[PDB]
C-alpha cells in the first residue's frame, strides 16, 4: 500500500456522518471538508502528524502569498501529481527493498503481537484486567502505518534496546487547527524560506529516509547532519511487518 | 571583496531599445547596457559629443540587472507591454533644409508595471571611482529617465551601497529577492547566457555591437 | 558604416532601370518554399508582424499543399541525424522600398528535430490555434453576427508577447521522443491566457447591459473554440 | 462558518402562515429588522454573527416573495452545479430581458426590490443554495453573470 | 537651491476624448495591473507649446534673441583651437550680415558653419557661390536665433535645420504621459447622419470617457540657464512659473469642439528637488470612487506624499494649490489660495 496514491485516510465529513476512507489526492484537491475519525485521539494525532510531515516534504509554499492562497484554494489534480511524483517510491508499506518505516531482514526469535504498537492497550501489569482484548488482532494498512509512525514519535519505546525517537521519549505535539483536515495539514507546514532557514540542506547532511539509507549500528550521528526529510520520518527501531492476512475487519 | 553601487529603476512606463532603423521603436524586457550607460551618463553632465567622457564611463562601469515583479495587495502583477501610435507633424524631410512632411508616424513600445534593481561596479581599467557615480545619482545634472524622456521615476535612483564577491550576493541585500539577474560578470553556478546588442560603439555615433549577458535564474 | 579604417571608400553609385523575366522557380538552396495547389511554388517571406515561432514550421518541416525547407537544412538533416540544430533565420518585411520591419533570430532545437517534424508542427499550429480563438471571439464582440469598438488586435499583441515567453522555450528544450505532456501543459497555459485576455479586453465596457449581452455571446464562441482545441 | 441555505429554505417552507404573513409585508430588505418574526426565523442561522446579516437579509427578502415562489430543485449528479437564477428566470418564459437589464443597473436596495418582483412573477425552479451564495456576494461580477446566463439561455432555449 | 522643479497636477475631465490612436480608440495604459485612460506626453506637450499663452510668454520673451555680435570673444576662444580668427570672423559676419557664456547648440552650429567656410576657402570658392550653396542653413539658423527661450524650454522644432550633434537640443522640461488615477469605465457613442433630403439608417461609433488625470512634469533649471547663455536662476524660475500655469490650464484640442472638456486642474503642487520624481505610485493601487473620483484621488496624493516624501528625499520647498478642501497635507508643505500665489512662490525660489 502506498500512502501517496492509495486510500488510507480515515475521515468523516466536517458536518457529516458515515466514515469513509480517502486518498491524499482527494484531500488536497477537494473543497470537501473533512475531519479525521478513529476511535482514539492519540491515533488521530499520529495521523495528523503523518499527513503534516508528508505535506512538509512534498509541498512547502514558496512564500506567505502562496501559503494563504493554497489554504484558500485546493490544488488541481495535475499540480498534485507533479508534486508527489518524486516521492512515491518512498511510501510503500510493503515494498521489496524499502518498506515504509521498516527494516528489511530482521532477526527475531518470535513474532511480536500487533498490540504492542497500540500505545496503552498493553504494557502495564493492570492492562489485561482493565482493557478489552483483541484490539491488535488484525489492523488496516492505515491503522498500521499510523501506529508505526506513532511508535517512532510520540509513544514510549518498547524497552530494553529500543531507542526512542528524535525528540526524546513522549514529546508533546502541538499543531495549529483549521476548518477542515485539509487546511489543518497545510497550516502546519513550514514555507520554503522558513524551512531552509531552519534546515540548510548540505551535501554534508543526509536527507534520505531511514528505510532507504539505514542508520549504521552504534553510529554517532551529529544531530546537525540530519535532513528535514530524514528526521521528520525518523525511525529509531528495527521493525518489519509480517505478511498480511486476507480480507476482514480492522480490529 | 568588491564594492557595489545599487540603483532602482522604477516607474509607470519604461523603454529599453532593440535594433531598429525603422519607425517602430521596440522595447526589451529589461534595461539595455547602452541604456544604463546613458542613464549614468545623464546624471553626470555628459554632452553628446564628449566622446572622451563617454568612453571613460563605458570602460569604467559594469552592470547586473534584476527584474522585480510587482505584488499589490498580495496579488502578483506580471509586466505587460504597450504600443503607442505616435505621430509627428512638421517632421523634417531632409537632414538639411526646412522642408517638412505633413505627417509622419512611429510606433513606440513601452513596458508597463516594470521595476528593476541594478548593481554596478568598477572594472580594472577604470578611470572613475564609485562615489563620483553615487554623487551623481544623488544629484544629477541632466534630467534622468527610464528609456525615454516621457518616463519619470517613481522611486529615487539611488537605492544603496555595499560590498561582496558576486553581483548576485550584493543584490541579495535589497528586496524583493527572487528575480532573474542578468550580469556582465559570470557566476560560477550558472552557464546560461543571453545574446544582445547593447554595446554602444562610441567611435561610431548611434551604432551598437553585440554582447552577451550572463543569466542567473531565480 | 563599419567604424573601421580602409584605404578605399565608396561615396556613391550609378543605377538605371532594367527589366527581364525568369519564368519558373529557381531552386535556391538558402530559403524554404511554400507549395499550394489550386500549382504555386513561392519562397517564404515575412508577411506579418507576428513572432518568429509562427514561421518555424515552414522553416524546419517538410510536407508533401505542402512545404519544402531549404536544401541546406535537409542536407544537414541527412548528414548529422544525431545532432541538435542551431539555425539562423532572417529577413525583411517591406512596403515597396520601405523597410517596415527587420528580423533576425537563432532558433534552437535538441536532437529529435530531423525525424519528429510532426511534433514541431503540432506545437506551432496549437499556438496559432489559440491565437485565432481569441481573435475570433473578440471579433465577435466587435461586430456580432456589435460593441462598436475593435479590441482584438491589441489583445492579439498582448497574446503574442506572452507567447514569446512560452512557445520557443518549449521547442528549444522539449524531448521530442516523448513530448505529449509538455505540449498538454502549453495548451493549458495558452487556454488561461486566452481567458484572461478576453476578460481584460471586454472589461472596460461591461458596465452597460447592452454590451453584456454581446459580451456573453462572444464568450460563448470563445469557449466553443477553446474546447475544440482539446484532443 | 458558511450560512446554511437549505436549512433556511426548509425553515421558510414550514413557517406558520401568520409569521410568513408578517414577513411578507416588508417592502425593502432592511425593514426585516422591524419584524420580530424575522429575527425568530434567522436566529438559528447565525443572525447573531454580524458577518452574516446583510446576506441573510437578502435571502429572506427573496424568499419573502411567497411561501413557494422559489421552487428548489437538486442538481443532477453529473453536472457540477444546478440551475442558476438567470437561467431559471429565462426558463420561466415570463421574464423580459430588459427587466434583467434594469436590474443589474439598479442602486442598492432597489435591486433587491426589483429582484423579488421578478421572482414572484416567474416562480423559478433553481438550485437554491447556489442563489444563496450569489446573494451572499452580490456584486458587479454576480450581476453580470446573471445577465449573461439569462442571455445565453434565452438564446438556446 | 535645488536643481529640479517637480510639478504635479490632478485634473478632472468631463466626458470626452482628448487623445486617440490609429483605430480612433482612446489611448491606453496598464498601471497597477489595471487599465487607465492615457493622454500622451506628446499630445500634452504640443498642447502647451502651440498655445497662445506659450506664444506670448515664451515665444515673445526678452531673452528670445541671441545677438551674435556680443558673442564674438567667447566664441573665438571656444573655437580658437579648431579654427583661425579669420575664418571665424568671416563666418559670423556671414550669419549676421560683450558676453562671456554661450549656449552649446550655438557653439555647435557655428562650428559646423565655420568648417564649411574653411572648406570653401581651401578651394578659393567665391563668397557669392558659398552663400548660394548654403542659403537654406543660413535662413534656418537665423530663425533659431530668434527663438531662444522656446528652444531652451521645449527643444528644437521637428524641422529646425540643426546640423550638429550639439544641435540635438533636449527640452529643459520633461513631460510624462498622463494616466487616470482610477480604472475607467469607457463609454461608446452611437451616432447617425441625417440626410435632409431622404430622412426615411447607418450608425457610426465613437469611444469616450471621463476621468481624473495625473499630470507630471519636471524642469531642469541648470539646463535652462545653460541653454539660455548662462541666464540667472531668477529668470529660469520665471520660465518655470509659466510652465506651471500651462500644465494647470492647457488641455489638448482633440474632439473638443464636439465634447468640450474645457476643464481647469483641481490640484497643482510644485515641489523642489535634487532628484525629479513622479508621484504616480500614489495611484499604483487604483483609486476607488467615493463621492466622485476627484476627492479620493487628491486624498491618495496627499497621503502618498506624507508616506514617502522624506524617505524618498524630496526635501525641498514645496507648495500646494487646490480647490477641493480635503484633509490637508504635511505642515511643511505650504498651502496656496490662488494659482497666481503659487506662481509667485515659485518665482522667488520657494519662500
Swiss-Prot record, chain A:
Inducing stimuli: Repressed by H-NS, activated by LeuO. Activated by the BaeSR two-component regulatory system, possibly due to envelope stress. Part of the casABCDE-ygbT-ygbF operon.
Effect of loss of the gene: Loss of resistance to bacteriophage lambda infection, loss of plasmid silencing.
Keyword check for Transcription: no
Keywords for the protein's UniProt record, in alphabetical order: Antiviral defense, DNA-binding, RNA-binding
Keyword match Transcription: no
A GO term from the CC aspect: protein-containing complex
GO BP, sorted A to Z: CRISPR-cas system; defense response to virus
GO molecular function terms listed in the Swiss-Prot or TrEMBL record: DNA binding; RNA binding; zinc ion binding
Subunit and interaction comment: Part of the Cascade ribonucleoprotein complex, with stoichiometry CasA(1),CasB(2),CasC(6),CasD(1),CasE(1)-crRNA(1). Interacts directly with the 5' end of crRNA, CasB, CasD and CasE. Binding of target ssRNA or dsDNA causes a conformational change in the Cascade complex; CasA is required for high affinity target DNA binding. Interacts with Cas3 once Cascade has recognized target DNA.
Family: Belongs to the CRISPR associated protein CasA/Cse1 family. Type I-E/Ecoli subfamily.
Protein name: CRISPR system Cascade subunit CasA
Protein's organism: Escherichia coli (strain K12)
Name of the gene encoding the protein in the UniProt record: casA
Positions spanned in the full protein: 1 to 251 of 502
UniProtKB/Swiss-Prot annotation, chain B:
Single GO molecular function: DNA/RNA hybrid binding
Disruption phenotype: Loss of resistance to bacteriophage lambda infection, loss of plasmid silencing. Decreased levels of crRNA.
InterPro entries given in the database record: CRISPR-assoc_prot_Cas5, CRISPR-assoc_prot_Cas5_N, CRISPR-assoc_prot_CasD
Keywords: Antiviral defense
One GO CC term on file: protein-containing complex
One Pfam entry name: Cas_Cas5d
UniProt induction comment: Repressed by H-NS, activated by LeuO. Activated by the BaeSR two-component regulatory system, possibly due to envelope stress. Part of the casABCDE-ygbT-ygbF operon.
Gene3D superfamilies linked: 3.30.70.2660
Gene Ontology biological process: CRISPR-cas system; defense response to virus; maintenance of CRISPR repeat elements
Recorded coiled-coil stretches: none
Source organism superkingdom: Bacteria
Assembly description: Part of the Cascade ribonucleoprotein complex, with stoichiometry CasA(1),CasB(2),CasC(6),CasD(1),CasE(1)-crRNA(1). Interacts directly with CasA and CasC. Stable subcomplexes of CasBCDE-crRNA and CasCDE-crRNA also form, both of which are able to bind target dsDNA, and at least CasCDE is able to form R-loops. CasCDE and CasCE complexes have endonuclease activity. Binding of target ssRNA or dsDNA causes a conformational change in the Cascade complex.
Similarity comment text for this entry: Belongs to the CRISPR-associated protein Cas5 family. Subtype I-E/Ecoli subfamily.
Protein's UniProt name: CRISPR system Cascade subunit CasD
Organism: Escherichia coli (strain K12)
Swiss-Prot record, chain D:
Entry's Gene Ontology cellular component terms: protein-containing complex
A Pfam family hit: CRISPR_Cse2
Keywords: Antiviral defense, RNA-binding
Upregulation: Repressed by H-NS, activated by LeuO. Activated by the BaeSR two-component regulatory system, possibly due to envelope stress. Part of the casABCDE-ygbT-ygbF operon.
Any one GO molecular-function label of the UniProt entry: RNA binding
Reported phenotype of the disruption mutant: Loss of resistance to bacteriophage lambda infection, loss of plasmid silencing. Increased levels of 57 nucleotide crRNA and also 2 and 3 spacer-repeat units.
BP term (GO), one: CRISPR-cas system
Intrachain disulfide bonds: none
InterPro entries: CRISPR-assoc_prot_Cse2, Cse2_sf
Protein family membership: Belongs to the CRISPR-associated CasB/Cse2 family.
Subunit composition and interactions: Homodimer. Part of the Cascade ribonucleoprotein complex, with stoichiometry CasA(1),CasB(2), CasC(6),CasD(1),CasE(1)-crRNA(1). The CasB homodimer forms a cleft that cradles the 3' end of the crRNA. Interacts directly with crRNA, CasA, CasC and CasE. Stable subcomplexes of CasBCDE-crRNA and CasCDE-crRNA also form, both of which are able to bind target dsDNA. Binding of target ssRNA or dsDNA causes a conformational change in the Cascade complex.
NCBIfam families associated with the record: casB_cse2
Protein name, UniProt field: CRISPR system Cascade subunit CasB
From Swiss-Prot, chain E:
Phenotype on disruption: Loss of resistance to bacteriophage lambda infection, loss of plasmid silencing. Increased levels of 57 nucleotide crRNA and also 2 and 3 spacer-repeat units.
Cellular component GO terms held in the UniProt record: protein-containing complex
Coiled coil: none
NCBIfam families per UniProt: casC_Cse4
Subunit structure comment from the entry: Part of the Cascade ribonucleoprotein complex, with stoichiometry CasA(1),CasB(2),CasC(6),CasD(1),CasE(1)-crRNA(1). The 6 CasC subunits make a helical stack forming a groove in which the crRNA lies. Interacts directly with all of the Cas subunits. Stable subcomplexes of CasBCDE-crRNA and CasCDE-crRNA also form, both of which are able to bind target dsDNA, and at least CasCDE is able to form R-loops. CasCDE and CasCE complexes have endonuclease activity. Interacts with YgbT (Cas1). Binding of target ssRNA or dsDNA causes a conformational change in the Cascade complex.
Record GO biological process: CRISPR-cas system; defense response to virus
InterPro entries recorded: CRISPR-assoc_prot_CT1975 (IPR010148)
Domain of life of the source: Bacteria
Protein induction: Repressed by H-NS, activated by LeuO. Activated by the BaeSR two-component regulatory system, possibly due to envelope stress. Part of the casABCDE-ygbT-ygbF operon.
Record-given protein name: CRISPR system Cascade subunit CasC
Biological source species: Escherichia coli (strain K12)
Lineage per the UniProt record: Bacteria, Pseudomonadati, Pseudomonadota, Gammaproteobacteria, Enterobacterales
Amino acid at each position: 500500500m502506498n500512502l501517496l496514491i492509495d486510500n488510507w485516510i480515515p475521515v468523516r465529513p466536517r458536518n457529516g456522518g458515515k466514515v469513509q476512507i480517502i486518498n491524499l489526492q482527494s484531500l488536497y484537491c477537494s473543497r470537501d471538508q473533512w475531519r479525521l475519525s478513529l476511535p482514539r485521539d492519540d491515533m488521530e494525532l499520529a495521523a495528523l502528524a503523518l499527513l503534516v510531515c508528508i505535506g512538509q516534504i512534498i509541498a512547502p509554499a514558496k512564500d506567505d502569498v502562496e501559503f494563504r492562497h493554497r489554504i484558500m484554494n485546493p490544488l488541481t489534480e495535475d499540480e498534485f501529481q507533479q508534486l508527489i511524483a518524486p516521492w512515491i517510491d518512498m511510501f510503500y508499506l510493503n515494498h521489496a527493498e524499502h518498506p515504509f518505516m521498516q527494516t528489511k531482514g530482521v532477526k527475531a526469535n518470535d513474532v511480536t503481537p500487533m498490540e504492542k504498537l497500540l500505545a496503552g492497550v498493553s504494557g502495564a501489569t493492570n492492562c489485561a484486567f482493565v482493557n478489552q482484548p483483541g484490539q491488535g488482532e488484525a489492523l488496516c494498512g492505515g491503522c498500521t502505518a499510523i501506529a508505526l509512525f506513532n511508535q517512532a514519535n510520540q509513544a514510549p519505546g518498547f524497552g530494553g534496546g529500543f531507542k526512542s525517537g528524535l525528540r526524546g521519549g513522549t514529546p508533546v505535539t502541538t499543531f495549529v487547527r483549521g476548518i477542515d483536515l485539509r487546511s489543518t495539514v497545510l497550516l502546519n507546514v513550514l514555507t520554503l524560506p522558513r524551512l531552509q532557514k531552519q534546515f540548510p540542506n548540505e551535501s554534508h547532511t543526509e536527507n534520505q529516509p531511514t528505510w532507504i539509507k539505514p542508520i549504521k549500528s552504534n553510529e554517532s550521528i551529529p544531530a546537525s547532519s540530519i535532513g528535514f526529510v530524514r528526521g521528520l520520518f525518523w525511525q529509531p527501531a528495527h521493525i518489519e511487518l509480517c505478511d498480511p492476512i486476507g480480507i476482514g475487519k480492522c480490529s | 571583496m568588491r564594492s557595489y553601487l545599487i540603483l532602482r529603476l522604477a516607474g509607470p512606463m519604461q523603454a529599453w531599445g532593440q535594433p531598429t532603423f525603422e519607425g517602430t521603436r521596440p522595447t526589451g524586457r529589461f534595461p539595455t547596457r547602452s541604456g544604463l550607460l546613458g542613464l549614468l551618463g545623464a546624471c553626470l553632465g555628459i554632452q553628446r559629443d564628449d566622446t572622451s567622457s563617454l568612453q571613460a564611463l563605458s570602460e569604467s562601469v559594469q552592470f547586473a540587472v534584476r527584474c522585480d515583479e510587482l505584488i499589490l495587495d498580495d496579488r502578483r502583477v506580471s509586466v505587460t507591454g504597450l504600443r503607442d501610435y505616435h505621430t509627428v507633424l512638421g517632421a523634417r524631410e531632409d537632414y538639411r533644409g526646412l522642408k517638412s512632411h505633413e505627417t509622419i508616424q512611429t510606433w513606440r513600445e513601452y513596458l508597463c508595471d516594470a521595476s528593476f534593481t541594478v548593481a554596478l561596479w568598477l572594472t580594472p581599467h577604470a578611470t572613475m571611482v564609485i562615489s563620483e557615480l553615487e554623487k551623481a545619482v544623488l544629484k544629477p545634472r541632466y534630467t534622468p529617465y527610464l528609456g525615454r524622456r516621457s518616463c519619470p521615476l517613481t522611486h529615487p535612483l539611488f537605492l544603496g551601497t555595499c560590498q561582496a564577491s558576486d553581483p548576485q550576493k550584493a543584490l541579495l541585500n535589497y528586496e524583493p529577492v527572487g528575480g532573474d539577474i542578468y550580469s556582465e560578470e559570470s557566476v560560477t553556478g550558472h552557464h546560461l547566457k543571453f545574446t544582445a546588442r547593447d554595446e554602444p560603439m562610441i567611435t561610431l555615433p548611434r551604432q551598437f555591437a553585440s554582447r552577451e549577458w550572463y543569466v542567473i535564474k531565480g | 558604416c563599419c567604424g573601421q579604417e580602409s584605404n578605399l571608400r565608396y561615396t556613391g553609385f550609378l543605377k538605371e532601370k532594367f527589366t527581364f523575366t525568369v519564368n519558373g522557380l529557381w531552386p535556391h538552396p538558402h530559403s524554404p518554399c511554400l507549395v499550394t495547389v489550386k500549382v504555386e511554388e513561392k519562397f517564404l517571406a515575412f508577411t506579418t508582424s507576428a513572432p518568429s515561432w509562427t514561421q518555424i514550421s515552414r522553416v524546419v518541416v517538410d510536407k508533401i499543399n505542402g512545404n519544402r525547407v531549404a536544401a541546406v537544412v535537409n542536407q544537414f538533416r541527412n548528414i548529422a541525424p544525431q545532432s541538435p540544430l542551431e539555425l539562423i533565420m532572417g529577413g525583411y518585411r517591406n512596403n515597396q522600398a520601405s523597410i517596415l520591419e527587420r528580423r533576425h533570430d537563432v532558433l534552437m532545437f535538441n536532437q529529435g528535430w530531423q525525424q519528429y517534424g510532426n511534433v514541431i508542427n503540432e506545437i506551432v499550429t496549437v499556438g496559432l490555434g489559440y491565437k485565432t480563438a481569441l481573435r475570433k471571439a473578440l471579433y465577435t464582440f466587435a461586430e456580432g453576427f456589435g460593441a462598436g469598438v475593435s479590441v482584438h488586435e491589441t489583445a492579439e499583441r498582448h497574446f503574442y508577447r506572452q507567447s514569446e515567453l512560452l512557445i520557443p522555450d518549449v521547442l528549444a528544450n522539449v524531448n521530442f521522443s516523448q513530448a505529449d505532456e509538455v505540449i498538454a501543459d502549453l495548451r493549458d497555459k495558452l487556454h488561461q491566457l486566452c481567458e484572461m485576455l478576453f476578460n481584460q479586453s471586454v472589461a472596460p465596457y461591461a458596465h452597460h447591459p447592452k454590451l453584456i449581452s454581446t459580451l456573453a455571446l462572444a464568450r460563448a464562441t470563445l469557449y466553443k473554440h477553446l474546447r475544440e482545441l482539446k484532443p | 462558518d458558511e450560512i446554511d441555505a437549505m436549512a433556511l429554505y426548509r425553515a421558510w417552507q414550514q413557517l406558520d402562515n401568520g409569521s410568513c404573513a408578517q414577513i411578507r409585508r416588508v417592502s425593502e430588505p432592511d425593514e426585516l429588522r422591524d419584524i420580530p418574526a424575522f429575527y425568530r426565523l434567522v436566529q438559528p442561522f447565525g443572525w447573531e454573527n454580524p458577518r452574516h446579516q446583510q446576506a441573510l437579509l437578502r435571502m429572506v427578502f427573496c424568499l419573502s416573495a411567497g411561501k413557494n415562489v422559489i421552487r428548489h430543485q437538486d442538481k443532477k449528479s453529473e453536472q457540477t452545479t444546478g440551475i442558476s437564477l438567470g437561467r431559471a428566470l429565462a426558463n420561466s418564459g415570463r421574464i423580459n430581458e430588459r427587466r434583467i437589464f434594469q436590474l443589474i443597473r439598479a442602486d442598492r436596495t432597489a435591486d433587491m426590490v426589483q429582484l423579488r418582483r421578478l421572482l414572484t412573477h416567474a416562480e423559478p425552479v433553481l438550485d437554491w443554495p447556489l442563489m444563496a451564495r450569489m446573494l451572499t456576494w452580490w456584486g458587479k461580477r454576480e450581476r453580470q453573470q446573471l445577465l449573461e446566463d439569462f442571455v445565453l439561455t434565452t438564446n438556446k432555449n | 537651491m535645488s536643481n529640479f522643479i517637480n510639478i504635479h497636477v490632478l485634473i478632472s475631465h468631463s466626458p470626452s476624448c482628448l487623445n486617440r490612436d490609429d483605430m480612433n480608440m482612446q489611448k491606453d495604459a496598464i498601471f497597477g495591473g489595471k487599465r487607465r485612460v492615457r493622454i500622451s506626453s506628446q499630445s500634452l506637450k504640443r498642447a502647451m507649446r502651440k498655445s497662445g499663452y506659450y506664444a506670448q510668454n515664451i515665444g515673445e520673451s526678452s531673452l528670445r534673441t541671441i545677438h551674435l555680435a556680443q558673442l564674438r570673444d567667447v566664441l573665438r576662444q571656444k573655437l580658437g583651437e579648431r579654427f583661425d580668427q579669420k575664418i571665424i570672423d568671416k563666418t559670423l559676419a556671414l550669419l549676421s550680415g560683450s558676453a562671456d557664456a554661450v549656449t552649446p547648440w550655438v557653439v555647435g552650429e557655428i562650428a559646423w558653419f565655420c568648417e564649411q567656410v574653411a572648406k570653401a576657402e581651401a578651394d578659393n570658392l567665391d563668397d557669392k557661390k558659398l552663400l548660394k550653396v548654403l542659403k537654406e542653413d543660413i535662413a534656418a539658423i537665423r530663425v533659431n536665433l530668434q527663438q531662444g527661450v522656446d528652444i531652451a524650454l521645449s527643444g528644437r522644432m521637428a524641422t529646425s535645420g540643426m546640423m550638429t550633434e550639439l544641435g540635438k537640443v533636449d527640452g529643459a522640461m520633461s513631460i510624462a504621459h498622463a494616466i487616470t488615477t482610477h480604472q475607467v469605465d469607457s463609454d461608446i457613442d452611437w451616432f447617425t447622419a441625417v440626410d435632409d433630403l431622404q430622412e426615411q439608417a447607418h450608425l457610426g461609433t465613437q469611444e469616450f470617457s471621463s476621468g481624473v488625470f495625473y499630470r507630471y512634469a519636471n524642469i531642469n533649471l541648470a539646463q535652462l540657464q545653460e541653454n539660455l547663455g548662462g541666464a540667472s536662476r531668477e529668470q529660469a524660475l520665471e520660465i518655470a512659473t509659466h510652465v506651471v500655469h500651462m500644465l494647470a490650464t492647457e488641455v489638448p484640442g482633440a474632439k473638443q469642439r464636439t465634447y468640450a472638456a474645457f476643464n481647469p486642474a483641481d490640484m497643482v503642487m510644485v515641489n523642489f528637488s535634487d532628484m525629479p520624481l513622479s508621484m504616480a505610485n500614489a495611484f499604483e493601487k487604483a483609486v476607488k470612487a467615493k463621492d466622485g473620483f476627484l476627492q479620493p484621488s487628491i486624498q491618495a496624493f496627499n497621503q502618498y506624499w506624507d508616506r514617502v516624501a522624506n524617505g524618498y528625499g524630496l526635501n525641498g520647498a514645496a507648495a500646494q494649490f487646490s480647490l477641493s478642501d480635503v484633509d490637508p497635507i504635511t505642515a511643511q508643505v505650504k498651502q496656496m489660495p490662488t494659482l497666481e500665489q503659487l506662481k509667485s512662490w515659485v518665482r522667488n525660489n520657494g519662500e
